[PDB]
Amino acid sequence: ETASGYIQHHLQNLTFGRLPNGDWGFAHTAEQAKEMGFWAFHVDTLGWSVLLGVVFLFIFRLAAKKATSGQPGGLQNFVEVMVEFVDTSVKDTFHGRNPLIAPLALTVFVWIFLLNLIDLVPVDYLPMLAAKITGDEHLFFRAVATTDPNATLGLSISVFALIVFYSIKVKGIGGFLGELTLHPFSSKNIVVQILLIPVNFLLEFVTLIAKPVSLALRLFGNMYAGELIFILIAVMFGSGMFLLSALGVALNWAWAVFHILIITLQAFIFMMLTIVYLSMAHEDNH
Amino acid sequence: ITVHCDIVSAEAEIFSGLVEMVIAHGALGDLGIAPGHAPLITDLKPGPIRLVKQGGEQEVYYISGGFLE
Amino acid sequence: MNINATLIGQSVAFFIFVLFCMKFVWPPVIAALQERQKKIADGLDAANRAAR
Amino acid sequence: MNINATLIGQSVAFFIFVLFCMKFVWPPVIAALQERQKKIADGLDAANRAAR
Amino acid sequence: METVVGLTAIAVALLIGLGALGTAIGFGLLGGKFLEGAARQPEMVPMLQVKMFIVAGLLDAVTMIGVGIALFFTFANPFVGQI
Amino acid sequence: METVVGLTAIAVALLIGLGALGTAIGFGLLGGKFLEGAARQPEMVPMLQVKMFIVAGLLDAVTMIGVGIALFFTFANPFVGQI
Amino acid sequence: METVVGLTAIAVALLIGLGALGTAIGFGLLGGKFLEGAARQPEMVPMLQVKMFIVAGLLDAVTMIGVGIALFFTFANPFVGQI
Amino acid sequence: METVVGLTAIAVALLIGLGALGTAIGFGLLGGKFLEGAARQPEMVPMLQVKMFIVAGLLDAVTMIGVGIALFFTFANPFVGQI
Amino acid sequence: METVVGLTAIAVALLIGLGALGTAIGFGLLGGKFLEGAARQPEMVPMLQVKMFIVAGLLDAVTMIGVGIALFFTFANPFVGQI
Amino acid sequence: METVVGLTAIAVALLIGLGALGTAIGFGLLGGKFLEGAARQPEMVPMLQVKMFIVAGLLDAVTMIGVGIALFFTFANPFVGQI
Amino acid sequence: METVVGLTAIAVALLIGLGALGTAIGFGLLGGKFLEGAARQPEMVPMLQVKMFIVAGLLDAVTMIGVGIALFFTFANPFVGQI
Amino acid sequence: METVVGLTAIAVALLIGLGALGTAIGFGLLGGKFLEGAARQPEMVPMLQVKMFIVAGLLDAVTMIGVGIALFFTFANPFVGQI
Amino acid sequence: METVVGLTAIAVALLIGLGALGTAIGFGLLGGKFLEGAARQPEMVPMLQVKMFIVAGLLDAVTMIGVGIALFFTFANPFVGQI
Amino acid sequence: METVVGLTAIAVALLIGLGALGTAIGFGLLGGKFLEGAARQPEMVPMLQVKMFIVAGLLDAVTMIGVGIALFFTFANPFVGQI
Ligand SMILES: [Zn+2]
C-alpha cells in the first residue's frame, strides 16, 4: 500500500444508511458513504460515545449508591474530589438555585475527557482489532469520537437548546426578545427605538449563534489536528529505515506528552463555557 | 455636586469644607479632582492649590509640597 | 472530512446521561459531602461550648 | 517494513511514554489523593474528641 | 472550472487564516489585562473571569462566521453552480 | 465568467477575513481596558459595561456592512449579470 | 470585458475590507481610552461622550468615502463604459 | 485598453483603502490621548481640543492627496490616453 | 489540473503560516503579563499559571482548525474531486 | 506599452498609499504624546509645539519624496521611453 | 510540472518566513518583560527564567510544525506525485 | 523588455513606499518619547534634542539606501541590459 | 525553466526579508527593555546583559534557519532537479 | 531571461524594502527607550549610549545580510545562469 492510501483509510467513518436498494447496510467505500444522505449514522462514533458515557456513570453510581458520609474508600474519595471541584466551579459563576447546571457540568467534563483520552492509545490498534474480530481487511473504524464534527456539534447544539430554554423560562418570551432587540441600545423616542431594533438584532443575534459553533469547532479542531499529527508520524515508521524509526519515537513521545495537557484543558474549557453561557441566560448582564 | 476636602499639615488643619473641584500640581503633571473621582495618591511639587465652590470660586492656598490622596 | 449524519443521535444520548446523573449520582454525593462538614462544624462548636 | 514496522514503532513509542507516565504523572496524583485521605481522618479525630 | 475551484482554496485560506491571526492577537491583548487584574485584586479573580468570557463572545463572532463560510466553500460550492 | 466568479470568491474572503482580523484586535484592545477599569473600580463595573457596548456598536459597524455585502456576493452576484 | 468586471470586485473588497480593518482597530484604541477616562471621573462622562463622538467623525471620514465609492463601483460601474 | 482600465480600478482601491486604514488607526491613537487628557484636566478641554485639530490637519494631509488623485483616476483616467 | 494542485500548496502555506504568526505574537503578549504577575507576587504563581493555560485554550482555538485543514489538503484533497 | 502603463498606475498607488498609511499612524503617535504633555504642563505648550514641528519635518521627509516621484510617474513617464 | 514546482518554492518561504517573523516579535515581547522583572526583582531571576522557557515552548509550537512541513516540501513533494 | 521595465516600476514603488511607511512610524515612536522626555525635564532639552538626532541617523540609514537604489533604477537600469 | 528559477528568487527574498523584518522589531522590543532596566538599576547591567543574550538566541533561532535555506536555494536550487 | 530578470527586480525591492521597514520601526522602539532612560537620570547617558550600540548590532545584523544579497543580485546574478 501507499502512504496516501494509509492516510485516506484513517479519515473514513463506519457509516450505516440507505443503500441503493434497502435501509439496512454498511458502506464499503467513501463514495458509497457520501451517497448516504443526512438519514445515516456513524456506528463507530455512537459505539464509542455511548459505551464511555455508561462506564463513567456506572463507576460514579458505585460510589453514590453506598456513600459512607464518614471515612471514604479509595473510589468515593476520587468521585467526591470531582463533585467538590465542579460545585466550586459552578458557585464562582452562577448564583441562582437551578438544580440542572451542576450535574450537567460534571457530565460534560468527565465525558469529553474520556472521549478524548482514547487518542493516546496507538492509532492502528483499535482499527486493526476491529478488522481481525470482523474478518475483513477494508473495514473503516475510528476510535476518537471528538474527531467527528457531528459528535462535537451534537454536544453544543444540545447546550444551545438549554440556553434558549432557560432564557425563555426565567426572562419570559417578552424578556427573551427584549434582550434580543431592546439591548444594548435603548431610547425614549419611538422613532429611535424602532431604528435601533435592526442594530440591536445584528449585534445580539450574531453573538448568540456563534456560541454553539465555537464550542463544537474549538473541540473538533484541537482533536482532529491532534490525531492527524499521530497518523503522519506513523508514516515515518512505514519507511522501514532505522535512523527514521528512531526520530519518529521522539516526535510521538513529545506529541503525546503535549497532547495530555490539551486533552485535559479542552474538557475544562467546554465545561467553563457551558457554566458561563448558562449563567448569563438567567440575569440581565447589561 | 460637592465632595468634602481637608488640607492638613503635621501641626494643624489649613482648610476643611465642601468643594466642587480641586486643582493641584502633581509630580508627573497638573490635576483636576471632582466628586466621584477614583482613588488616587500622588506627591505634590511646591505651588498653589485652587479650590472651587459656589461663591468661593477662587479659594487658593499655597503648599510647600506633601501628598494628595 | 465533513458529512452530516448521526447529529440527532448524539444530541438525544447526551440528555439521557445528563438527567441520569442529575437524579441518581449527584444528590447522594453532596449529602455525604455535607455530613462531614456538619460533623466537623458540630465538633468545633461543641469544643467552644465546653470552654464557654 | 510498512504496516509491520509502523505497528512495532508505534507500540515501542507508547511503551517508552507509558514508562515515564507511571513514574512521574501517576505517583504525584496518588500522593495528593492519599494526602486528602489522611486529612479527613485527622480532621474527624477532633470531632470524636469533642464528645469526650 | 479549474480556476473557480483553485481560487476557492485561496479564498478558504484567507477566511480561516486572517481570523486565526486576529483571534490569537486579540485573546493575547485581552488575556494580558486579565492576568494583571488577577494580580492587582486577588479576591476579584472569579468576577474578572466571567466578564472576560463575555468579551470573548464579541471577540470571536465575525471569526466564527468565517470558519463556517470557509467550511461551506470546502464541501459545497456556491460558485461552481454558476459555471 | 469563470474569471469573474473565481475573483468573486476571493473578493468575499477578503471582505470577511479583513473584518475578522480588525474586530478581533479591536475587541482585544477595548476589552483589555474594560478589565483594567473593572479591577480598579469594581463598583463601576455595571456602568463601564454599558459604555463598553456603546463603543462595540461603533467598532463593528463597517465590519457588518462588509459581511452583509460578502453574503450578497455569494447568494446573488451583481458582477455576473454585468458581463 | 471579464477582466475589468472581475478586477472591480477585488477593488470593492479592498475599499471596504481595508476601511473595516482600520475602523475596528481605531475604535478599539479610542474606546479603550474612553473607558479609562470614565473609570477615573464618572462625573465627566456626559462631557467625555460628546468629545469621543467629535473624534469618531474624524476617525471614520475616509472610511465612509471608500464605502460610497465601493457601492458605486458595484451598482452602475464607472470603468465598464470607459473601454 | 482592458488591462489599463482593470489595473486602474485596483489603483483607486489602494489609494483610498490604504489612506482609510492609516487615518482610522491614526485618529484612534491621537483621539485616545485627547480623552485621557480631558479626564485628567476637565478645565483644559477647550485648550486641548484646538491643539488636537492642529495635529488632525497634519495626520490627514497626505491622505487627502490620495483621495484627490483616486477620484481623478476614476472620472478622468490619465493612463488610458498614454497607450 | 496543475492550477488546483499548485494553489493548494499556497493555501496550505497561508493557512499554517498565518496561524504560526498569530500564536507566537498572541502568546508573547500573554506570557509577558504572566512573568510580570509572577514578579509582583511569587505566592500566586501556581494559580496564575493555571489561569494562563485557561486563556491558552481560547487563544489557540481557530489556529488549530487551520493546521488541521492544511494537513488535510496536503495528503487528502477535496478540490481535485470537484475538477 | 499597455502593461508598462497599467503597472505604472499600481506603482503610483503604492507610492502615495503606503506614504498616506505611514504618515497618518506616525502623526497619531507623535500627536497623542503632544496632547498628553499639554494637559500635564500647560506652561510648556509653546515649546512643545515648536519641538513637534521639528519632528514633523523628519516624519514626512521620505513620504514627500514618494509623493514627488508618484506625480512625476503620472504627468510624465520614465518607463514608457524605455519601450 | 513547472507551476507546481515553482509555487511550492513560494509556499516554503511563506511557511518558514512567516514563522520567523512571529517568533522574533514574540520573543522580544516575552524577553522584554523578563528583563523588566529581573531588574525589579533580581532575586526571582532563577524562577522567572524557568517560567519563560515553559512559555517559549507554547510560542515555538506551530512554527516548528511549519518549519518541518517546509523541509518535507524541499526534499520530497506530496504535490508532484498528484500530477 | 516590456515586462522587465514594468516590474522595475513596481520595484521602485515598493522600495520607496516601504521605506516611507517604516520611517513615518519610526519617527512617530521616537518623537512621541522626545516630547514626553522634554516635558519631564525642560533643562535637559538641549541634550535630548542632540541625542534624538543620533537615533534619527540610525533610523533612516537603510531607508536612504533604498531611496538611492530606487533613483538608480529609475534614471539608469541594471535590468534593461537584459544582463 | 524560467518560472521555477524566477519564483525561487522571490522565495529567497521572502525568507531573508520576513526574517529581517521580525528580528529588527523583536530586538527593539527586547533591547528597549534592556536600556530601561539599565537606566533604573545600573549595578545590575552585567546580569541583565547576560540574560538578554539568552533571549537573543531564542529570538534568532527560526530566522537563522530561514537564512541558511535561502542561501541553499540561491547556490543549489533543489527544485531545478525536480523537472 | 525576461521572466528571471524581471522577477529579480521585485526580489531586490523586497530585500531592501522589508529590511528598511523593520530597521526603521526597530530603532524607533530602541531609541525611544534610550531618550526615556536619558531623561530619568541625566548622568547615565554615557553608559546608555554604549549599551544602545551593542543592541544596534543585533538589530541590523540580518538587514545587512539582506542589503548585501540585494546588491549581489543587482550587479551579478546567480539565477541568470541557472537559466
Ligand atoms: Zn440587558
Kindly determine whether residue I11 and residue E7, on different chains, have CB atoms separated by under 8 Å: no
Distance, CA E35 to ligand 1 centroid (Å)? 27
Residue G42 Cα, gap to closest chain F Cα (Å): 9
How many CB atoms are closer than 10 A to CB A216?
23
> In terms of residues, how long is chain B?
69
Concatenated DSSP letters of G53-80: HHHHHHHHHHHHHHHHHHHHHHSS-HHH
3-state secondary structure of H34: helix
Helix or strand run (H / E) with residue B42: strand B42-43
Cβ separation M32–N30 shorter than 8 A: yes
Which string of DSSP letters, residue by residue, matches chain A? --HHHHHHHHT---EEE-BTTBS--B-SSHHHHHHS-SSEEEHHHHHHHHHHHHHHHHHHHHTTTT--SSSPPHHHHHHHHHHHHHHHHHHTT--S--SSHHHHHHHHHHHHHHHHHTTSS-TTHHHHHHHHHHT-SS------GGGSHHHHHHHHHHHHHHHHHHHHHHHHHHHHHHHHHTSS---SSHHHHHHHHHHHHHHHHHHHHHHHHHHHHHHHHHHHHHHHHHHHHHHHHHT--TTTTTHHHHHHHHHHHHHHHHHHHHHHHHHHHHHHHHHTTSS---
Question: In this structure, what C-alpha cell is assigned to residue M68?
Answer: 541558511
Q: Which of I17, I28, I49 sits opposite K25 (nearest CB)?
A: I28
User: Is F83 in a helix, a strand, or coil?
Assistant: coil
Distance in angstroms (rounded) separating the CA atoms of residues I76 and A29:
15
Q: Could you tell me which of K83, L44, E71, N59 has the C-alpha nearest to residue I4? A: K83
Query: What CA–CA distance (Å, rounded) separates M17 from N19?
Result: 6
- CA dist L44 and L49 (Å) reads 9
Q: Which of N2, H69, J77, H81 is nearest to L7 (CA)?
A: N2
Q: Supply φ then ψ for residue B25, to 5 degrees.
A: -95, 95
Q: Which three cell numbers stand for residue H9?
A: 480600478
- Taking residue E54's Cβ as centre, other Cβ atoms within 10 Å add up to 18
K9, K21, K23 ranked by CB distance to M8: nearest: K9
Cell of L13: 514603488
I-contacting residues in E 59-78 (Cβ below 8 Å): 60, 63, 67, 74-75, 77
* L37 in contact with N, Cβ within 8 Å: yes
Residue D35, sorted as left (phi over 0), alpha (psi -120 to 50) or beta, turns out to be alpha
The shortest CB-CB distance from H80 to any of G10, G59, G82 is to G82
Nearest to H33 by CA among E68, N79, K42, J37: J37
A209 reaches F (C-beta below 8 A): no
Cβ pairs bridging L and N (under 8 Å): 149
Cα J37 to Cα I52, J48, J59: the distances in Å are: 36, 8, 19
- F and A touching (3 or more beta-carbon pairs closer than 8 Å): yes
**CA distances from residue H40 to B50, B65, G48, J39, M8 in whole angstroms, order as listed:** 15, 20, 11, 7, 56
Looking at beta carbons, which residues of chain F come within 8 Å of B41?
A: none
Q: Tell me the catalytic residues of K.
A: 60
What CA–CA distance (Å, rounded) separates N13 from N17?
6
> What residues pair up with B61 in beta bridges, in sequence order?
B49
CA dihedral over I15, I21, I27, I33, signed as positive or negative: negative
Question: Nearest-CA neighbor of J38 among B32, H59, H47, N40?
Answer: H47
Q: Does A269 touch chain I (CB under 8 A)?
A: yes
Q: Give the distance (Å) from ligand 1 centre to CA of residue A280.
A: 10
Cα dihedral sign, B27-B43-N47-M58 = negative
Contacting residues for M67 by C-beta, under 8 A, at least 6 apart: M15, M16, M19, N62, N65
- Residue N69 in contact with residue N4, Cβ under 8 Å? no
Question: Rounded to the nearest 5°, which phi and psi values hold at F76?
Answer: -140, 170
Is the Cβ–Cβ distance between A72 and A80 less than 8 Å?
Answer: yes
Contact B21, G44 (CB under 8 A): no
Q: Residue F21 corresponds to which cell in the numbers above?
A: 482580523
DSSP annotation of B44 = B
CA distance K82 to L3: 32
Tell me how far apart the alpha carbons of residues I50 and I34 are, in angstroms, rounded to a whole number: 10
Distance (Å, rounded) from C-alpha A233 to C-alpha A255? 10
In which region does residue B26 sit, left (phi positive, over 0), alpha (psi from -120 to 50) or beta (all else)? beta
- A207 interfaces chain F, CB cutoff of 8 Å: no
Distance of alpha carbon M28 from alpha carbon M42, whole angstroms: 20
Say which amino acid occupies F46. P
CA pair distance A16, A133, nearest whole angstrom = 19
Taking CA–CA distances from B1, the nearest residue in chain G reads G43
Cα M7 to Cα M13: distance, rounded to the nearest angstrom: 10
Nearest CA in chain L to J60: L24
Measured CA to CA in angstroms, residue K57 lies from K54, K61, M58, N40, N51 at distances of 5, 6, 11, 36, 29
- G residues 43-62 closer than 8 Å to B (CB): 43-44
- Comparing CB atoms, the residue among L25, L54, L73 nearest residue N28 is L25
Closest residue to E58, CB basis, from A207, A279, A285: A207
Cα of A180 from ligand 1 centre, angstroms = 9
d(C-alpha N28, C-alpha L25), whole Å: 8
The CA distance from E72 to F9, in Å, is 12
Cβ atoms of M21 and M14 closer than 8 Å: no
A222:I64 CB<8 A: yes
Q: Distance from CA of residue K62 to its chain's centroid?
A: 7
- How far is the C-alpha of N24 from the C-alpha of L24, rounded, in Å? 9
Q: How was this structure determined?
A: cryo-EM
Measure A184 CA to ligand 1 centroid, in angstroms: 6
Q: How far is CA H48 from CA A257, J33, J52, in A?
A: 57, 12, 15
Give residues preceding each break in chain M, C–N over 2.5 A.
none
SS3 F1: coil
Here the cell at position A160 is 444551545
E3 at the F interface (CB within 8 A)?
yes
Residue I46: exposure state from Cβ atoms within 10 A (0-12, 13-18, ≥19): exposed
Hey, are the CB atoms on D41 and A252 less than 8 Å from each other?
no
In sequence order, the β-bridge partners of residue I24 are: none
CA torsion G3-G5-G7-G8 (nearest 10°) is 160
Residues contacting residue K73 through CB under 8 Å, at least 6 positions apart: I9, K8, K11, K12, K15
Pairwise CB contact (< 8 Å): K3 & M3: yes
Cα H16 to Cα F12, G12, H11, H64, H77: the distances in Å are: 19, 11, 9, 9, 16
C11, burial (CB in 10 Å: exposed 0-12, middle 13-18, buried 19+) = middle
Residue B50 DSSP symbol? E
- Answer whether I62's CB lies under 8 Å from E23's CB: yes
G50 touches chain H (CB under 8 A): no
Greatest CA span in chain H, whole angstroms? 61
Residues 25-44 of D with CB under 8 A from C: 40, 43-44
What b/e readout covers F20-46, taking b as 16+ CB neighbours within 10 angstroms? bbbbbbbbbbbbbbbbbbbbbbeebbe
Q: How many helices (H) and strands (E) does chain C have?
A: 2, 0
Report how far residue L82's alpha carbon sits from residue N1's, in angstroms, rounded to the nearest whole number.
Answer: 7
Beta bridge partners of B7: B15
Q: CA-CA distance, A189 to A171, in Å (whole number)?
A: 25
The yes-or-no answer on residue G26 being catalytic is no
Are A69 and C35 a contacting pair at CB < 8 A?
A: yes
Cα–Cα dist A163/A274, whole Å: 9
* E strand or H helix at B54: none
Alpha-carbon span K27 to A180, nearest angstrom: 43
How many angstroms away from the CA of K75 is the closest CA of chain I? 15
**Nearest CB to F14; choose among G13, G19, G28:** G13
For residue D33, count other CB atoms closer than 10 A to its CB: 13
Contacts 24+ apart (CB under 8 A), M72-75: M73/K9, M73/M8, M73/M11, M73/M12, M73/M15, M74/M8, M74/M12, M74/N69, M74/N78, M74/N79, M75/N78
Answer whether F28's CB lies under 8 Å from E30's CB. yes
Task: Check chain B for breaks (C–N over 2.5 Å) and list the residue before each, or none.
Answer: none
DSSP H or E stretch at residue B25:
strand B21-25
d(CA L62, CA L49): 22
Pairwise CB contact (< 8 Å): G79 & H19: no
N76 sits in which H/E element: none
Question: How far is it, in rounded angstroms, from Cα G34 to Cα F59?
Answer: 13
| Grid cell at residue F12 | 468575499
Inter-chain CB proximity K31 and M36 less than 8 Å:
no
Rounded CA Rg of chain J: 19
Q: Which residues contact N5 (CB under 8 A, 6 or more apart)?
A: L4, L79, L82, N77, N80
Q: Considering only CA atoms, which of L30, L16, L33 is closest in space to residue L58?
A: L30
Grid cell 449520582 in the structure block, residue: C25
CA L66 to chain centre: 7
For residues K76 and F10, what is the distance between their CA atoms, to the nearest angstrom? 30
Q: Rounded distance, CA N22 to CA K28, Å?
A: 13
Distance CA K16, CA F20 (A): 24
B31 beta partners: B24
CB A143 within 8 A of CB A121: yes
The one-letter code for the residue type at M3 is: T
* Single-letter amino acid code for the residue at K50: V
Q: Which of G22, G27, G34, G60 is catalytic?
A: G60
- Listing DSSP states for K22-42 in one string gives HHHHHHHHHHHHHHHHHHH-T
| Resolution of the PDB structure in angstroms | 2.8
Residue E6 near residue I77 (C-beta atoms within 8 A): no
> Residue holding cell 456602568?
F47
Whole-Å CA distances, N17 to J56, L12, M10: 22, 10, 13
- The C-alpha cell of A68 is what? 459512607
Residue in A77, A125, A253 nearest the CB of D16 = A253
CA distances (Å), origin J51, targets A249, K20, L37, L52, M26: 63, 38, 12, 12, 29
Interacting residues of G57 by C-beta distance below 8 A, sequence separation 6+: none
Residues on chain I touching K44 (C-beta within 8 angstroms)? 38-39, 42
Distance, in angstroms, between G66 CA and closest chain H CA?
6
HEC secondary structure over chain E: CHHHHHHHHHHHHHHHHHHHHHHHHHHHHHHHHHHHHHHHCHHHHHHHHHHHHHHHHHHHHHHHHHHHHHHHHHHCCCCHHHC
- DSSP conformation class of B55: S
Q: Scanning every residue of chain B, which has its alpha carbon at the shortest distance from the alpha carbon of F42? A: B38
Cell of A171: 426572562
Contacts L77 to N, Cβ<8 Å: none
N20's grid cell: 528598511
